[PDB]
Amino acid sequence: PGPRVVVIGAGLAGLAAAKALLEQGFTDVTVLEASSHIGGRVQSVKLGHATFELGATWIHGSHGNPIYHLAEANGLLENGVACYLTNHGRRIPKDVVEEFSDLYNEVYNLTQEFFVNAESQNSVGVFTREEVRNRIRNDPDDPEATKRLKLAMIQQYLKVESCESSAHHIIPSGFMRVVELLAEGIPAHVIQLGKPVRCIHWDQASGSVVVECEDCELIPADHVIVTVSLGVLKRQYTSFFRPGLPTEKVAAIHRLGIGTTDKIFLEFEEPFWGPECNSLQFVWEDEAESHTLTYPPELWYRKICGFDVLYPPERYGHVLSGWICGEEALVMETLSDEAVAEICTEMLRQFTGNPNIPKPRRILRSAWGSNPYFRGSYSYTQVGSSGADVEKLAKPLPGLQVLFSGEATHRKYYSTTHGALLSGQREAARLIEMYRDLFQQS
Amino acid sequence: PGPRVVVIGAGLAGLAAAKALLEQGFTDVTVLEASSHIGGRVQSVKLGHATFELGATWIHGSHGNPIYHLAEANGLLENGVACYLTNHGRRIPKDVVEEFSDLYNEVYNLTQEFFVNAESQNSVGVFTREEVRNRIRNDPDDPEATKRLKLAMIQQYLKVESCESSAHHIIPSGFMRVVELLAEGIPAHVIQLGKPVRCIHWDQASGSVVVECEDCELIPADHVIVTVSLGVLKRQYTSFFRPGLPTEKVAAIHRLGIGTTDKIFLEFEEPFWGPECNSLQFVWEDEAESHTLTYPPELWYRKICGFDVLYPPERYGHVLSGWICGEEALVMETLSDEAVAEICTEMLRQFTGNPNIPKPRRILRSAWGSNPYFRGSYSYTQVGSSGADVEKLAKPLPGLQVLFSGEATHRKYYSTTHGALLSGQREAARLIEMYRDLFQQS
Ligand SMILES: C=C=CCNCCCC/N=C/C=C(\C)N1c2cc(C)c(C)cc2N(C[C@H](O)[C@H](O)[C@H](O)COP(=O)(O)OP(=O)(O)OC[C@H]2O[C@@H](n3cnc4c(N)ncnc43)[C@H](O)[C@@H]2O)c2[nH]c(=O)[nH]c(=O)c21
Ligand SMILES: C=C=CCNCCCC/N=C/C=C(\C)N1c2cc(C)c(C)cc2N(C[C@H](O)[C@H](O)[C@H](O)COP(=O)(O)OP(=O)(O)OC[C@H]2O[C@@H](n3cnc4c(N)ncnc43)[C@H](O)[C@@H]2O)c2[nH]c(=O)[nH]c(=O)c21
Ligand SMILES: [Cl-]
Ligand SMILES: [Cl-]
Ligand SMILES: [Cl-]
Ligand SMILES: [Cl-]
Fold it and tell me: Residue of A30, A39, B44, B76 with fewest CB within 10 Å of its CB?
């Protein structure tokens, strides 16, 4: 009864692939989702009336962006200053920050002009910071205390740059509404929840592919679209494919990077922050000399660059939204809500110079790195890798027996929701063209 | 190329089944063993020259016993008093122990005569102890202190009875020598080590059975002989069979018992025990009133009835051999060698009344309950179950697609090495008869 297609993952890529096939008259389609939910790294949570994003937060502008189009078409779509604080409870003056910002931006451009691959982009940052460090050290007119603060702001910027990897729209109702739109069309029977896959068996001798589920169910199939993260692949490629993947694809899985980026929300009964403060930015004065990329686990909290104040209060309450990227996010994920809440409260006391700040009423946080269905937040082309690795990863296996979809497999829109969606449509489109060729040949 | 037979487990049952098939001209035979070793619950360890059994220790006499025959044919086969000590470092006099022993044996026989199923055997113990407790309490001539000791000896006996479940020969070279004899004949390629099975798939549409390995290898087969313990079945039957087992067999798996019985060996530099002492038997004076079947985890050590002195010293060194049965053995298995060694040393100080006993030089111990390939030491017909459950467990699935072997599936020799061996030959014999019928019919 037609070709049997199995999609692994009910994130944007898996749902987009499933929908595209169903719309082109593929009846025998089943989505195997590991978790109890759809959307994957799109995860919207409601604390009372308020809606908080634990994954994807922003749509990256654009009319061509098919997630903007989805949202706008269904009508889902829609202050003050960054307060820089020192670890001895002092605010850094406007003029110091503004002076640093301009020095950094001037030196970043003189560097970026001098250089556009992965190793190029990274080295702009590295040589910018060392030149900025020189210009501060060698400035004859700045006093000692001011130089120590500005040098520590290099380390604060470095932490902000560590989370960065791509004008910007939010969905106040929840990013999960966009996910629910894609899934509307899909019949109920198609999406199997709580159904993690253990291994894909290909080059077999009615069904040349067998999907081995964790619950030991064997599902024969003609084609499999794999949408699991680069994190899942890195951890499981050795056991997840029989026979082994082509060595080019194994190399791609090794060379491409995936970052753990977790969100920390702190709900307070009353606010303790000035009405001029959009954010609290944490500058540790003892980090003037350090070039620290990864902190030891005891100092995981130091990788938090600061906290944004959510606006408006009536929508969200009095909530601080922090980000933590890298191995320090994995350490954070191992700690209890009380242990995390306590350390963030301690930090905010030290940085505000106000020892009477109460522990937050509630705490909400993501755990993407430790989750065996994600093992990270988003992909990037790493200091070593290229766009060739993304093409290698995306490349189907012989017979289109296994196709590779997901954000990581998208050449220009990797680490985005639209990248995921479009990577799904690409692989669905690949099958459609293959079965058009059989129609045209015969 | 002939019928494809897969044996799960390279214990006595699996090896016996494999050998029997190979000897009757079954060429296409493979044994999948989870662990890196053969023998299963036969496990011999050498500390220097000495050989210590962590599993099966004794051959239960007999000429008909095929393990006696195996040993004797290859020439592998071959003091003092039990010292009863109180928890206040006092030895219980010969006459007190002898008086208790006779009271127990007299009252056990008067009860056993009055009653022979599982619920019958257990109830003999229960009504014996309560009658003994009465006869002690109501004895007009015994003093108070003596009654408290004798009543606490009921609890010490109760612990010894908790490990009991079946004249007696040892193999000084190692019980593993008997295992190695069976395996001699078996070609190298047949036994796959480090190869745990995850699920057996039966009622399929060239190979009506698929064995799903933990490493995700799918092995087509005509017949599967399952030799894993009742412990493994109890824990994994829900996931280990597709489709589900007959409800009669599920009920049998539930109703039949498997006990965790672990061995503790303590090697001392010098002995601290009298040359008259074969064993140190631990009587806790505060257990006069208790009828405790299972201790809380904090008091796991109380389930140790005492320690045997191994003889002769030149063979073994100065070693104490203790046994611990039940949930208290699972608690023991979670503790470190230092933590276990320390508590046993503390006990021996309290019970000898000698506070200067050094911590043992070495410690050796089994961990059958926590081991996912055993989850217990041996089967028994439980207070509720019958020999009908053993027949239900032993019963093959339709087509002899799956056969059930192992100690637990043997009607009279369950919980023994010969039971395991003979249960293997039974299932091998079952296949041989099935393929003799096809030879005679056609
Ligand atoms: C002043 C000032 C400061 C402000 N600075 C401005 C800078 C802002 C720059 N933007 C940042 C954006 C972030 C951080 N954004 C962000 C933040 C965070 C915290 C995250 C986690 C992500 C993001 N991204 C990336 C996307 O979320 C991601 O690419 C896609 O959802 C993935 O889709 P998929 O490929 O289908 O995989 P999926 O994993 O979703 O689905 C696969 C499924 O497979 C399942 N699975 C796994 N194993 C399985 C198995 N064995 N068997 C069966 N199933 C299995 C699994 O359960 C899943 O359901 C963002 N994207 C975007 O558009 N906007 C954004 O803001 C962000
Ligand atoms: C004065 C005074 C005091 C003295 N008192 C005297 C009283 C003495 C009474 N006797 C007591 C005897 C004991 C306690 N004895 C004793 C003590 C102790 C500590 C133990 C642990 C046992 C015993 N017994 C029982 C036997 O050891 C047991 O029945 C068989 O070896 C099991 O064989 P099998 O069926 O093949 O299973 P196996 O489990 O061996 O093999 C199955 C294989 O399957 C493998 N497997 C599991 N899962 C798998 C998967 N998923 N995939 C693939 N493979 C997988 C696994 O790794 C194994 O290798 C004894 N027997 C005996 O004859 N003499 C004895 O003394 C004792
Ligand atoms: Cl199945
Ligand atoms: Cl990482
Ligand atoms: Cl395979
Ligand atoms: Cl138990």
Answer: A30
Q: What is the resolution of this structure in A?
A: 2.4
Domains of chain A: which residue ranges? Answer: 5-38+177-258+380-441, 81-168+261-365
Choose the CATH number for B81-168+261-365 among 2.60.40.10, 3.40.50.720, 3.90.660.10, 3.90.550.10. Answer: 3.90.660.10
CATH architecture of the domain formed by A5-38+177-258+380-441 = 3-Layer(bba) Sandwich (3.50)
Contact criterion met (CB below 8 Å) for A169 and A68: yes
Residue A151 phi, psi (nearest 5): -65, -40
DSSP at B368:
T
Interface test with A, best of B202, B204, B216 (most A CBs within 10 A): B216
Question: Which chain A residues are within 8 Å of B217, Cβ to Cβ?
Answer: 242
CATH number belonging to the domain at B5-40+173-256+379-441, selected among 3.40.50.12710, 3.50.50.60, 3.30.70.2750, 3.40.50.720: 3.50.50.60
Integer angstrom CA distances of residue B87 from A264, B284, B354: 56, 5, 12
Q: Is the peptide bond preceding residue A220 cis, with omega within 30 degrees of 0? A: no
Q: Name the method of structure determination.
A: X-ray
Q: Is the CB of A33 under 6 A from ligand 1?
A: yes
CA distances in angstroms from B438 to B203, B397, B435, B441, listed in the order given: 20, 19, 5, 5
Is B201 in contact with A218 (Cβ distance < 8 A)? Answer: yes
Quick one: which of A376, A401, A405, A395 has its CA closest to A10? Answer: A405
Report the residue of B197, B218, B237 to disrupt the A interface, i.e. the one with the largest count of A CBs within 10 Å.
Answer: B218
Give the H or E element holding residue B352: helix B337-352
- The total of other beta-carbon atoms located within 10 Å of residue B283's CB is 26
**Nearest Cα residue to A179 out of A366, A18, A40, A368:** A40
β-bridge pairing A241-242 and A197-201: parallel
- How many beta carbons lie within 10 A of that of residue B243, not counting itself? 9
The three-state secondary structure class of B165 is coil
A201 reaches B (C-beta below 8 A): yes
Residues B212, A217: C-beta atoms closer than 8 Å? no
Among the listed residues A292, A259, A229, the one whose alpha carbon sits nearest the alpha carbon of residue A381: A259
Question: In this complex, is the C-beta atom of B216 within 8 Å of any C-beta atom belonging to chain A?
Answer: yes
User: How far, in Å, is the centroid of ligand 4 from the Cα of A43?
Assistant: 20
Please give the DSSP secondary-structure letter assigned to residue B217: -
Pocket of ligand 2 (CB under 6 A): B 8-14, 32-35, 40-42, 55-58, 166, 196-197, 227-229, 232, 261, 263, 366, 368, 373-374, 377-378, 406-407, 415-417, 419-420
